[PDB]
Amino acid sequence: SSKGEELFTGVVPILVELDGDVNGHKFSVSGEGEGDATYGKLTLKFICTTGKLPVPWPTLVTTFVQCFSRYPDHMKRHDFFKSAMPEGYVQERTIFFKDDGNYKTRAEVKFEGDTLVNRIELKGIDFKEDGNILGHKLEYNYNSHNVYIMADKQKNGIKVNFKIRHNIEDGSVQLADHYQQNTPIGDGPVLLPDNHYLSTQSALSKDPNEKRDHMVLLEFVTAAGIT
Amino acid sequence: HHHHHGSDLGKKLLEAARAGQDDEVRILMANGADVNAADNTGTTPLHLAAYSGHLEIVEVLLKHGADVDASDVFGYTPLHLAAYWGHLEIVEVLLKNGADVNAMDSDGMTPLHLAAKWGYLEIVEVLLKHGALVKAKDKFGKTPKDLARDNGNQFIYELLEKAELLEKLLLEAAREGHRDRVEEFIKRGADVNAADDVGVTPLHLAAQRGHLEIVEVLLKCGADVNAADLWGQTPLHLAATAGHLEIVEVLLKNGADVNARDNIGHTPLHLAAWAGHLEIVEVLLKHGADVNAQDKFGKTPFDLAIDNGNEDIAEVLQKA
Amino acid sequence: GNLVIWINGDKGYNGLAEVGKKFEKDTGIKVTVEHPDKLEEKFPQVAATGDGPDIIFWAHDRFGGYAQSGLLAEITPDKAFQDKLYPFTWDAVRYNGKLIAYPIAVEALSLIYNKDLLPNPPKTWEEIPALDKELKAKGKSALMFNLQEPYFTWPLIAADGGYAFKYENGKYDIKDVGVDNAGAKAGLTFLVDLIKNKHMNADTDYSIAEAAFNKGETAMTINGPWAWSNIDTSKVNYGVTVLPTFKGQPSKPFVGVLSAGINAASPNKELAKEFLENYLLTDEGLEAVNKDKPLGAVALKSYEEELAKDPRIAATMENAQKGEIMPNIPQMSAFWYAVRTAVINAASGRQTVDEALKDAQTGS
């Protein structure tokens, strides 16, 4: 079996590092844990090292390793994230918060030893000072979404686009439109996938012992739509 | 656990126990005084007798029916005072009478934190033998180790870090599955219910990895079957997630909660159907599991079967 | 031609009579003194009618209410005579930045210690727990003082930044209060840690503390120069020293400054300023009254040194210098009840440190 497949037959330690900037508010966050592609499960815990976080944790969930997704036997041929490994791939997005600022992310997803790292850079501009983001008005829960993927031969990668639903404390809904593109880093061949989609679960938590502004995450991700 | 009485006969009893007048305490027992009398601040005769060091009085009040885990307003119990004041003889009797070994107070300080701050080597090893978990963190996150050093008790520091080390080895043994190593560490004083900074115990590790032999050994010595990590996952969840049938049986036989839910809201049955485990599903049903449990996103175990393309598993559930 | 003086009974009124005999000797002014108790409640009523003498003798806190109603005249001592008294003693007579009375004596708190049981007393609050254990083994307590009245507990909570009302260039900021600051929140918590750990019991009064120390049941206490006579009666060999240091900085006890003002409705004001400056404030005048009743500290910087020969008073003066002067504005009525009620609840767990001190901050 290919390397990408053999690397995710069991549990894999995970590292996540990020540095961000939002309307002159520069911060940095790091988290760690582990994942299991065989079951799509992700167990993580993110800590803010730069004092307190000036943005809500839900906004950054997508930013913070889709290679840990469950691809059934009937559609392993469409698993691009694993094929790109262990070489890695660069992930870029442009998050459009409706009636507010926007994020731009650049991330490298590669193996550093046996650990899988996700190093990121976050850029935020044009956010309203008393908006939902900079005003901390978003609830501390996450909904479910379906990510849609389609090949991109001319760029050798995948064109991913989806929209997230954030819940505000007043009972309203905020949209964050995600325009995403993933291109590998190694010359090794990759499996460009047909038009397929995913389905995600999430639930955010806390830790009574950790005294720093943090977050806990539990996710389940699976592919479907094709037989 | 906690009182708040009030009586003239009680006030006489507290003063009598504080000063250590053994006899006058006994006369008050027969004369109608309340053994569990509490004053304004919730202090009982057992509190004053434990801090005063009058073992005679302590023994009597336990025989009569004093609350060993009585928590005054500040969270202190007879074990806190008996430890803050270094009364080894009293710390040994309150433990024989089933006292909460790791009793947090208002500030999260457990009895061990106190035995470490002042450096009572005797009380320490006593509390450790009765299951006092080492990595007990308070409001300021200062474990007994982080607190023993701040006061210059270096022999305590080593004996603690030498214990925290054993616990980490117990997880590594259970994770990799070495039955002989895991037996060594338990015999050396490694708390079976030792949870690392992420809240996982060697019971989860022996269940998710499928090391049956190590499981019952942890349970036999008193491993918490319903132990939850920071994500609310139970050794029963991980036994179904991975699909190790034999461990699922043992966990239930020992009292594994079938209705448990992770931080998303997945029952052990939600996971068995997810991971496509034909037999694991029939076992959880055999033990009466909520057929129509809805996670945080309102999806039954039936739904998780279809979305993943699990034919037979879905059918089995639709029948039940 | 005539002049009367009121005073309390506990103080030495006899010696004062001898001083009034000399003033009538040199210029023929009739001097008379009588001391009816409850004179503090009797002054504001008699002050409106204009009766009652010019010279009064009482603490400075009550003059803030007398001067508030404009019943005491402004004094004007010589700039050179002020050099004879300590500067910080005049902060008790400045109302709205103006003098309204003459300083007399000082009265501050000091710790006592039984030398027969503890020769070297500790110098820091932090080392009493270890000392209490050391002494509890021998069936005796280390410290035990009045906790109800906050006057005895304020020295600690005020050490690490706590203050009643901000004092600036002779005026108090009614807006600013120093009870919710994190400095005092750290002080009180250490005190509660003693009650929490059974070093002291919350239900301790002045009467209970005095009784214990006088019978050797304890090794330390706190009190002013008013109870020093009762200890020698109990035959206990005692000593006085500075109050220990919390966080390394000394304690801030409220400083009581005996004062003497001038009634605004008297016909002979200049006939009292003459006596209070040249005839009363003298090494002979103070020595006579002190012989009748020990006064403790002294306003005159000179005779204070003559008394400093006794280590009791030398130690008492150090406490006043290292402490804030008790405010005199009427807002203290809403402060005592606010704090005195907060100290009890916090020291009993009925309210936390923050809850009990923010509610006290609203009262002010």
Numbering used by the authors:
A (entry chain C): 1 to 64, 68 to 230
B (entry chain A): 6 to 325
C (entry chain B): 5 to 368
What does the paper say about this structure?
In this paper, we present a strategy to fuse specific, high-affinity protein binders to obtain multivalent or multispecific scaffolds of predetermined geometry. DARPins are used as building blocks to confer the desired specificity to the construct. A series of rigid connector modules replacing the DARPin capping repeats allow to combine the individual DARPin domains in such a way that their distance and angle can be altered to test different geometries, bringing the binding partners of the DARPins into a defined spatial arrangement. The two helices are not just joined end-to-end, but instead the two domains are made to overlap in such a way that the joining helix is stabilized by contacts with the domain cores along its entire length.
All 9 off7_Hxx_3G124 constructs were able to bind MBP and GFP simultaneously, demonstrating the absence of steric hindrance between the two targets, consistent with the structural models. Two DD constructs yielded crystals of the ternary complex: off7:MBP_H10_3G124:GFP crystallized in space group C2 (3.1 Å resolution, 3 complexes/ asymmetric unit (a.u.)) and off7:MBP_H11_3G124:GFP in space group P21212 (3.0 Å resolution). The structures of off7:MBP_H10_3G124:GFP and off7:MBP_H11_3G124:GFP confirm that DD fusions are capable of crystallizing with two target proteins bound simultaneously. In the complexes, the interactions between DARPins and target proteins were found to be very similar to the interactions seen in the absence of fusion partners. This is an important observation, as this reassures that any conclusions derived from complexes of DD and DDD fusions will also be valid for individual DARPins.
